[PDB]
């Protein structure tokens, strides 16, 4: 029973680290989707803010 | 740093310096009577160490299991009595627990098992309490070994560390060894030795048991009482040196009062 | 708003269990955790445009208005798609292994499902048998039992 | 402030001022009892509280004539690298006459391999 | 007036007794038990700068402190509990911290909501 | 300067009047005394209580 067992919840074990990993290489490359706008929104202002 | 503060701190160490100087008057004749009453049984471990010099016997490769005992009273302000034994007692089954003996240790007394219960909170067989607070005697040696016996444990090697009372500044904290079972205390010193069997070996070794506790509990007991009379007069001299400077704050802050209250006068007149 | 969602995965994540790897998953969630809400401040859109409001009410234009007009009129330079190789080769091997370990511990049951039938078998009375008895408790050839 | 001097120094700070604040607050005790009538755990902010008051002093350029001994000047990287390793408790074996006057924390263990 | 009448007896349950510095005997089902209570809710107690809470983002951390739901963690590690458990109520929780700004109380149901979240949180935070 | 009436002296009670570390020493050792006496008492009532009935 244990041995059975052993193999059984092993593998709902090896599916929670493609999970994990999944979400987690789309969401460090979403981090940097913004932030690659946000330091073009940071030069706009920047320009104009001398000027003033 | 007001004048009511300094009241009150310095009329706190008046009531302490007393207190203390009292307790050592205590204590000096609590020492006074455990002088005397250690010279009798200072004869009573001369004779088991007189039948080990005859007959030198050894524990010789390795045991299965093993005892460690260690004396003390349950009565702080005593210095450094009780971690002079506890910090002995880790200093040896760190060296042992590598040729393989299972250790298991028994502290009499409430202060060592204080100590040692957050690191060898495990090899506990036995405790005990109310040591010294009456003083100690042969009676209450045959409780620690009788108890030792309804307990199941074959101990086959052990030891007892107490302070071995020098004088009224030093005790020296020394170890004694224990051969318990009848395999290493018969051996070739032994082959001289007649009409004692296996059981009478069993019988002999037993009364031993309450016999070296009996020798510890008449050392670690005159040295908790010298060590309670020399670090009571350190606390009363250490008082002394408190107050003295703590009344000439206090008398230049009487004295700086008079003349700051008076200046409120004379220029509350002048201003009219 | 490009955001995706997941699983419930924090309490037997970190029992991956590899080969004395807990350093392995320790690390992971401890990246999954700062990476979450940092990137959800992320994912859904830029605020307003700051530079229009203020280049108009100054006067000095000729690289004001102009250079809100040539910067702000191209394509957001978005990431590279570079995680795609351990998304199957990963999965597939422990779905594989998932397949022999299931029936190799299936023969192990099912062999362990004929030991206690055949001890049933032994056994129909307690004055059964000299024969049957003598499957389970051993018997040898000679000079084999020293006491 | 964290956001200024860096979260990582901010916390060598905060934690050194929590450590000498316990060696001032049982000095009442100390000196009446002693320091034998204390547990285990307050004999290790005692003891970690005299290398660290130690270890405040230094050497100045414009002291060289008194005394004759050279002005030490220590950088800020190697301040925070060096009171780490008293307060993590690596250094709990070199005396405290070691980590007297002396500029970075290399001296310190140098001053301590003097003395043997 | 329900998490910080019962928290005010118990921190005034430790002031009495918490002032020792040198121990010499050892009372764990008798004394230590309450004074691991205090220090969970000291370290409770201290705050940052310039980022004030709400009243039903203190509500929620301070049911986990004295529902004994902390005496399994070291004291060393209760400010980083608290950020972490803060950011995930926020978060994924929003719609239960409103029944308590708008009913005012903290009721039996929403004493059974938030018996889970404490322990499936306390499940998976150091992993 | 205690033996002179001109000269100050201390009342009994002073060191907790204080508040200082030995007032708290003293404070705290007595809860931790008065606090494990108030369960030997409390489990010891229910059948004391039994035996005023029985006699």
Same mark, same amino acid.
């Given at each position: 029973?244990?041995?059975?067992?052993?193999?059984?919840?092993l593998v709902?074990?090896r599916?929670?680290l493609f999970?994990?990993?999944?979400?987690?290489?789309?969401?460090?490359l979403?981090?940097?989707?913004?932030?690659?706008? *946000?330091?073009?929104?940071?030069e706009?202002?920047?320009?104009?803010?001398? *000027?003033? | 740093?007001t004048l009511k503060d300094?009241?009150?701190?310095?009329?706190?160490?008046?009531?302490?310096?007393?207190?203390?100087?009292? &307790?050592? &008057?205590?204590?000096?004749?609590?020492?006074a009577?455990?002088?005397?009453?250690?010279?009798?049984?200072?004869?009573?471990?001369?004779?088991?160490?007189?039948?080990?010099e005859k007959?030198d016997?050894?524990v010789?490769?390795?045991?299965?299991k093993?005892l460690?005992?260690?004396v003390?009273?349950?009565?702080?302000?005593?210095?450094?009595?009780?971690?002079?034994?506890?910090?002995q007692?880790?200093?040896?089954?760190?060296?042992?627990?590598?040729?393989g003996?299972?250790?298991?240790?028994?502290g009499?007394?409430?202060?060592?098992?204080?100590?040692?219960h957050?690191?060898?909170?495990?090899?506990?067989?036995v405790?005990?309490?109310?040591?010294?607070?009456?003083?100690?005697?042969?009676?209450?040696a045959?409780?620690?070994?009788?108890?030792?016996?309804?307990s199941?444990?074959?101990?086959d090697?052990?030891?007892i560390?107490?302070?071995?009372?020098?004088?009224?500044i030093?005790?020296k904290?020394?170890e004694?060894?224990?051969?318990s079972?009848d395999?290493?205390a018969?051996?070739?010193? &032994?082959?001289?030795?007649?009409?004692?069997d296996?059981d009478?070996?069993?019988?002999?070794?037993?009364?031993?048991?309450?016999?070296?506790?009996?020798?510890?509990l008449?050392?670690?007991?005159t040295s908790?009482?010298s060590?309670?009379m020399?670090?009571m007069d350190?606390?009363?001299?250490?008082a002394?040196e408190m107050?003295?400077k703590?009344?000439?704050?206090?008398?230049?802050?009487?004295?700086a009062?008079?003349?700051?209250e008076?200046?409120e006068?004379?220029?509350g007149?002048?201003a009219? | 708003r490009?955001?995706? !969602? %997941?699983?419930?995965?924090?309490?037997?994540?970190?029992?991956?269990?590899?080969?004395?790897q807990? =350093?392995? =998953?320790?690390?992971?969630?401890?990246?999954?955790?700062?990476?979450?809400?940092?990137?959800?401040? !992320?994912?859904?859109?830029?605020? =307003?445009?700051?530079?229009?409001?203020?280049? =108009?009410?100054?006067?000095?234009?000729?690289?004001?208005?102009?250079?809100e007009?040539?910067?702000?009129?191209?394509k957001?330079?978005?990431?590279?798609?570079?995680?795609?190789?351990?998304?199957?080769?990963?999965?597939?091997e422990?779905?594989?292994?998932?397949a022999?370990? !299931?029936?190799?511990? %299936?023969?192990?049951?099912?062999?362990?499902?004929?030991?206690?039938?055949?001890? %049933?078998?032994?056994?129909?009375?307690?004055?059964?048998?000299?024969e049957?008895?003598?499957?389970?408790?051993?018997?040898?050839?000679?000079?084999?039992?020293?006491? | 402030?964290?956001?200024?001097?860096?979260?990582?120094?901010?916390?060598?700070?905060r934690?050194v001022?929590?450590?000498?604040? #316990?060696?001032?607050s049982?000095?009442?005790?100390?000196?009446?009892?002693?320091m #034998?009538?204390?547990?285990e755990? #307050?004999?290790?902010?005692?003891?970690?509280?005299?290398?660290?008051?130690?270890?405040?002093?230094?050497?100045?350029?414009?002291?060289?004539?008194?005394?004759?001994?050279?002005?030490?000047?220590?950088?800020? @990287?190697?301040?925070?690298?060096?009171?780490?390793?008293?307060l993590?408790?690596?250094?709990?074996?070199?005396?405290?006459?070691?980590?007297?006057?002396?500029?970075?924390?290399?001296?310190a263990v140098?001053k301590? #391999? @003097?003395?043997? | 007036?329900?998490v910080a009448?019962?928290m005010?007896?118990?921190?005034?349950?430790y002031?009495?007794?918490?002032?020792?510095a040198?121990?010499?005997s050892?009372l764990?089902?008798?004394?230590?038990?309450?004074?691991?209570?205090g220090?969970?809710?000291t370290?409770?107690?201290?705050?940052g +700068?310039?980022?004030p809470?709400?009243?039903?983002? +203190?509500?929620?951390?301070i049911?986990?402190g004295?529902?004994g739901?902390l005496?399994?963690?070291?004291?060393?590690?209760?400010?980083?509990?608290?950020?972490?458990?803060?950011?995930?109520v926020?978060?994924?929780?929003?719609?239960?911290?409103?029944?308590?700004?708008?009913?005012?109380?903290?009721?039996?149901?929403?004493?059974?909501?938030?018996?889970?979240?404490?322990?499936?949180?306390?499940?998976?935070?150091?992993? | 300067?205690?033996?002179?009436?001109?000269?100050?002296?201390?009342?009994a009670?002073?060191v907790?009047?204080?508040?200082?570390?030995?007032?708290?020493?003293?404070?705290?050792?007595?809860?931790?005394?008065?606090?494990?006496?108030?369960?030997?008492?409390?489990?010891?009532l229910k059948?004391?209580?039994?035996?005023?009935?029985?006699?």
């Amino acid at each position: 029973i244990d041995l059975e067992k052993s193999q059984q919840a092993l593998v709902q074990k090896r599916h929670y680290l493609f999970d994990v990993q999944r979400n987690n290489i789309a969401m460090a490359l979403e981090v940097t989707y913004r932030e690659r706008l *946000h330091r073009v929104y940071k030069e706009i202002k920047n320009r104009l803010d001398y *000027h003033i | 740093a007001t004048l009511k503060d300094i009241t009150r701190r310095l009329k706190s160490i008046k009531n302490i310096q007393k207190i203390t100087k009292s &307790m050592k &008057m205590v204590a000096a004749a609590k020492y006074a009577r455990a002088e005397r009453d250690l010279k009798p049984a200072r004869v009573y471990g001369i004779g088991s160490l007189a039948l080990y010099e005859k007959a030198d016997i050894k524990v010789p490769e390795d045991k299965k299991k093993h005892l460690i005992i260690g004396v003390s009273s349950d009565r702080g302000l005593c210095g450094a009595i009780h971690s002079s034994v506890a910090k002995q007692i880790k200093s040896e089954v760190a060296n042992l627990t590598a040729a393989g003996k299972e250790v298991k240790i028994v502290g009499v007394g409430d202060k060592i098992r204080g100590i040692l219960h957050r690191t060898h909170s495990d090899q506990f067989l036995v405790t005990f309490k109310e040591v010294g607070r009456k003083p100690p005697t042969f009676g209450d040696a045959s409780v620690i070994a009788l108890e030792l016996l309804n307990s199941g444990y074959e101990f086959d090697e052990g030891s007892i560390i107490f302070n071995r009372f020098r004088s009224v500044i030093s005790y020296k904290t020394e170890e004694k060894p224990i051969f318990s079972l009848d395999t290493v205390a018969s051996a070739e010193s &032994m082959s001289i030795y007649d009409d004692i069997d296996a059981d009478v070996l069993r019988n002999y070794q037993e009364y031993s048991l309450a016999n070296i506790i009996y020798y510890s509990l008449k050392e670690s007991t005159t040295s908790e009482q010298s060590a309670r009379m020399t670090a009571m007069d350190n606390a009363s001299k250490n008082a002394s040196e408190m107050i003295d400077k703590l009344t000439l704050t206090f008398n230049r802050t009487r004295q700086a009062v008079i003349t700051k209250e008076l200046i409120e006068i004379i220029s509350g007149a002048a201003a009219l | 708003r490009k955001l995706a !969602l %997941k699983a419930i995965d924090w309490v037997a994540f970190g029992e991956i269990i590899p080969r004395n790897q807990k =350093a392995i =998953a320790n690390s992971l969630k401890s990246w999954n955790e700062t990476l979450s809400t940092r990137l959800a401040a !992320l994912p859904e859109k830029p605020p =307003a445009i700051d530079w229009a409001y203020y280049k =108009a009410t100054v006067a000095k234009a000729g690289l004001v208005d102009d250079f809100e007009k040539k910067f702000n009129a191209l394509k957001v330079p978005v990431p590279e798609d570079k995680y795609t190789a351990l998304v199957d080769a990963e999965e597939q091997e422990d779905v594989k292994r998932c397949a022999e370990f !299931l029936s190799l511990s %299936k023969a192990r049951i099912e062999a362990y499902e004929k030991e206690l039938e055949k001890m %049933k078998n032994i056994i129909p009375f307690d004055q059964m048998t000299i024969e049957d008895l003598n499957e389970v408790f051993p018997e040898t050839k000679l000079d084999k039992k020293k006491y | 402030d964290p956001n200024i001097v860096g979260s990582e120094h901010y916390d060598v700070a905060r934690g050194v001022q929590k450590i000498l604040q #316990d060696y001032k607050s049982l000095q009442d005790i100390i000196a009446i009892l002693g320091m #034998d009538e204390l547990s285990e755990e #307050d004999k290790l902010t005692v003891s970690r509280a005299r290398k660290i008051q130690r270890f405040l002093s230094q050497p100045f350029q414009v002291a060289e004539v008194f005394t004759g001994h050279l002005g030490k000047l220590v950088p800020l @990287k190697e301040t925070i690298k060096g009171f780490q390793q008293i307060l993590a408790g690596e250094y709990d074996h070199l005396p405290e006459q070691a980590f007297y006057m002396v500029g970075p924390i290399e001296e310190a263990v140098a001053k301590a #391999d @003097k003395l043997a | 007036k329900q998490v910080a009448g019962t928290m005010k007896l118990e921190l005034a349950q430790y002031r009495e007794v918490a002032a020792f510095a040198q121990f010499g005997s050892d009372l764990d089902a008798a004394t230590q038990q309450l004074l691991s209570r205090g220090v969970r809710l000291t370290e409770l107690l201290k705050q940052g +700068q310039y980022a004030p809470m709400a009243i039903e983002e +203190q509500v929620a951390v301070i049911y986990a402190g004295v529902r004994g739901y902390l005496d399994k963690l070291e004291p060393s590690k209760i400010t980083k509990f608290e950020n972490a458990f803060l950011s995930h109520v926020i978060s994924q929780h929003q719609a239960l911290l409103g029944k308590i700004r708008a009913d005012g109380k903290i009721s039996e149901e929403t004493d059974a909501k938030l018996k889970e979240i404490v322990t499936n949180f306390l499940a998976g935070f150091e992993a | 300067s205690s033996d002179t009436p001109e000269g100050v002296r201390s009342g009994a009670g002073a060191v907790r009047d204080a508040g200082g570390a030995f007032g708290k020493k003293e404070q705290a050792d007595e809860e931790r005394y008065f606090r494990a006496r108030a369960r030997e008492q409390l489990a010891a009532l229910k059948k004391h209580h039994e035996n005023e009935i029985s006699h």
